[PDB]
């Protein structure tokens, strides 16, 4: 999980700007701007490089906050 | 200014139609969803009676078991006040639901019952739509039901029934008219004085239905002596309600309290927000009780109070009065007597009732397919039945035994008393289904002739494995009978599953003796399931041990022989929703409107049915399907050769179907005819029911019926006379005709001894659709097929006699002869083929062709997977006024491709060309460009049309201008790209160069010759522009070099021909374009070829889409055509060779003659147009020469867009080679 | 939006600088094309609805 | 049995596997209904058997 969370981590400091330090447990998508298109290219993201079955909308649905979304990749 | 009352009926009004007619319903969800769910609740809240209460209930799954209870009277009134309420309720939802009338609204509407309808005036009075009703209904249907059991419990204690019941109850109530109200209660009061009768047994006043008209209740005895008291002018009669009810002195709120009961409280119960218009109450208008209130004071009103219906007018007219409106509009439901209604109420109005008695009700057409009503009980359809038969070979012969009325027992044959046996017992056709020609003896006879007669069947049926969407590899079951005797009889269906290729379900039923009947009924209950689209049926009965042992089998209409005349049948029929055959246009015979059947549980000595039995049965059958006794003409029996049964039967069926009057006369009007096919070729144990199937099949299709021989001697003692009763038996043919604009209904039931009883209704074949279009097509493909030498003879033969015979029908036979024949049969390996314009062209190709055959000559299959093609697109050297303009007309898939390419072209800025496609006069007066666009379109229409045909191309082949057509079937290019090049570089090269600078000449010699004849080096004074053949070159250059050149050749002698190309390609002419031809060029989307590309340009095989880079369009358009070194590169690399069939995709055989020439004289070419031959005499050739070759060509888009020539002719059967096994 | 036939779409879509984020959508046709597209196109679609006044 | 995409163990709960064959033999025509016996008893009991074949 270690490594793949970390990948992740790189796609979504690359997508929202941030660094890696930044993205933290109670960093929320709204403050960090993940606006709706930026789920969908980042789900897409991740699905083509770390090869995981994240559905589109999880991350909106399901990830308000980073902590959600790290226990989502904890699987 | 118009308002809309609702009115519901009390007991009174009779509702067994309008239950049987709901019943029916089967286009409505809300409606059957409905009938459904209500006799659950009604057994639910059955089931809470008191015991003597539930001892006197009937047994019933559904309500169709009541009705007929109900029409007899013996229903008691627990149950009937709910079944009443159940057909107001359903009567008003299908009104407004298949209606689509607007639910009734409060702005313009209003709600009124009388003693059962006020219970259901507040369901109705809540909900504001049909879905949000049902749940208040089934409650209401609750309701009703408590409160029925409660007055009928109350009723019962006050008085018991009488000891001439009989089952019947009775009534309670009468109405007394010739006397006003109060008198009438005045004259109870003295009544009652004169006696001394308890307080809760007096008679009393239930109604007061006018000042001239009033109703009286009371016990029964009481009520009829009563009764006796009131003498004339005053008149009474006895209503058929059950219990007393609107007593003020035999019920309490407490009663109240315990009907209601059943609806838990709440806070959800919505609030009543129609108004309810009551009259009986002292107010008359109720709104916004919640619905238990509502609910409770119509209870109390139904059981406390006297319904006062004279004031129910003056009601009704004071609310619309009150609303402001001048009219109101009745819509009675079920209520009795509601035609003096409507003037009654409008009476007390302003007198401004505007007609206006219309209602436009045209339903909207429904989306296509979704017509059909739900897959849930829809008729079924019987495709084809095919079988042997007791001294008989197939049908047509079975009938022919069947006119002549002659018995089929004789002799057993020494090969294997008398007995119906069939004659030749055991023969297979071992080479067709792929077996050792020893190990046939293995498989038992009964598989062999199931599977000869599933095959002869299916053929005849004109179905053939994935070509429909119903008619799929795994959408077709088998349902086989079995009798008493993997590759065993187990598997039957399993081998015909595995041998045709069907992929789907397969059982072996048997129950008891009607294991084929059985089969049937499940395989239309699986097809009615949607399981499977279409199933073969039809069980079998042949013997293998002959076991023959008295001397007799059975007697001429009576029962003193002690054998049953048992016989041997193999029958089998087909089987599809009668939707999906008429949307494919199969031969339908019979339909199988609907299927009934019980068991019989009761037994007089061993194994019996009763009549009581029986005549439910019918009469079920007879409702589910809709249709009375009177429509129904023939009935035929199954039996068992029982001694009590297969005569006493005949007078147990006519019980239903043609009852006889109490007074004396004939209940029927047209005449009925009863048969049994046991008779002559005996009964089949396990496919009697099946035999007298197809015997019921031959009879529609023959219209006749068949003389008995029977009925011989005097008439049996337990069978009398039919003859009153509108009914008989035939000595001689007796002509049937079908109905004009009618159908005649056949009844088939089965009476095994074992109990089983299932019976069936037949139907005659929807109107037989006339076909009005004409084929335009002048030549027609007839086409055979087999699958060795023999068999291929014998069909032959067996098509040639056929012709010989209907050689005089019609002219519009042909093409029915050419679909059935091609498109609705699979196409084995030995095929043979004739082509002509009529019937006679045919029959003597087919005779000649024959005689050839038997000379001597020898049968070669075809090769494994067929020829393979090469194609070839002809350049703009050959193009005519018409180009296939036919093809534009006739068919769809061309006209929508031409279409769909003007409409590119004009997006391009292009010139349109559907003008060239339609009026064929504007070839004369057609710009350069039009033209080369009109060539490409052209091409490409024809390529994909050819395509779909079922021919793929091997290898591709063009000449300077069919390139651009050549790629784009190899897949390199999207038709867009094609088009967009081909416009563009004829835009560039018209508007950069001037027309006629250049020119070009044709010459016919060796190019050493040409050269050596000719002053000046080529290349300055003239270029070889393209190499075409070995001897065929064709030069260009300027007027003055091509003059020149002109001269000096023909000053030698050698013939030349000037072209009349006005520009010339691959010269000096198209130099100035190339920089923009490119640029053009590179925008396109080159791909990797799909198939070898014979590239003249380079001369030589591409197949890599580096060759293609945006230069090489240039390089094509620039250099030279060298057609003769790319074809022998070709040739060498075994891509071409003497076995392929070349075939050119333009106007005419130019490009083909230049292949066959390269690549040997002994290879076939073909042409799909040419100026001076209608384009369908080379296609038939064409399509001819494919499939004798071995090609799959997908024959039933050959004839999709002519709607006239669809139809499945009967053609005879397969010629098997018939070999003899038996061990 | 854009779109456009994939090839061709693709190489529009590699000139698209990195602040100019894009996406793939499941579509599988041509919409929304003034160009490709006419009355004829409206009046074949809607054929299938029979002619009636109620 | 799902294989993650990475590779992992998604199934979390145990997928025990049986068959009957082994313990009594094969009916042909039985095989179902003793099967269906042999779960209805294993419910009842709610106690997944040894298994044999080894």
Redesign the interface.
Known sequence: IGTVWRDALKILSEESGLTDEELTDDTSFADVGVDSLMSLVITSRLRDELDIDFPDRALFEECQTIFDLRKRFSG | AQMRVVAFGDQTYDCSEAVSQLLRVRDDAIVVDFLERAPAVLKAELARLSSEQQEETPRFATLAELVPRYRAGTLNPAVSQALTCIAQLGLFIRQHSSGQEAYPTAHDSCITGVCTGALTAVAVGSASSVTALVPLALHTVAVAVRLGARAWEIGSCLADARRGANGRYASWTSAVGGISPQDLQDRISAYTAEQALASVSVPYLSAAVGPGQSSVSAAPVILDAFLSTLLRPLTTTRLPITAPYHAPHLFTAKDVQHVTDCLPPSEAWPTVRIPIISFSRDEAVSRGASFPAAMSEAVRDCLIRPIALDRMAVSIANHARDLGKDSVLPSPIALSFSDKLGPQVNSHLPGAKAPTPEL?S?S??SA?GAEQQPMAKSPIAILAASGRFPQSSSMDQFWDVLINGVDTHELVPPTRGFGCWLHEAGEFDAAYFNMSPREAPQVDPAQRLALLTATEALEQAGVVPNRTSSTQKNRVGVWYGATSNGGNRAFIPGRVNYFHKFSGPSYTIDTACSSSLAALHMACNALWRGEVDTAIVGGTNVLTNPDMTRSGNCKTFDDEADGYCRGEAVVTLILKRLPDAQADKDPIQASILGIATNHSAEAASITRPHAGAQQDLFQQVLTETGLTANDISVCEMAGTGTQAGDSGETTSVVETLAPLNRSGSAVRTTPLYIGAVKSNVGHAESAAGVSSLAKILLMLKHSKIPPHVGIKTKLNHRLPDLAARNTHIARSEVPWPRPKNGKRRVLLNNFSAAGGNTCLVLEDAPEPEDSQEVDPREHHIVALSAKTPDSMVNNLTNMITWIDKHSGDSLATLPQLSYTTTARRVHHRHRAVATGTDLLQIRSSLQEQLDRRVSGERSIPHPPNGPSFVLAFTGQGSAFAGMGVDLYKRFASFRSDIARYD?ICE?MSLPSIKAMFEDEKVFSTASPTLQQLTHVCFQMALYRLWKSLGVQAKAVVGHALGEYAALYAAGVLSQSDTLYLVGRRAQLMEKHLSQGTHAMLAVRAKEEAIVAAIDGPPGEAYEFSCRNGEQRNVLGGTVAQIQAAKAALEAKKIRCQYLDTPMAFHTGQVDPILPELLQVAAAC?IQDPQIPVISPAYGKVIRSAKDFQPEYFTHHCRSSVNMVDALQSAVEEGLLDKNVIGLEIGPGPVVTQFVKEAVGTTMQTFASINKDKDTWQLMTQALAKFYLAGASVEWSRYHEDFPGAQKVLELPAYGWALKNYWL
Request: glycine share 12%.
């Open positions: 436009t045209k909207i057409p296509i409409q997006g989307s």
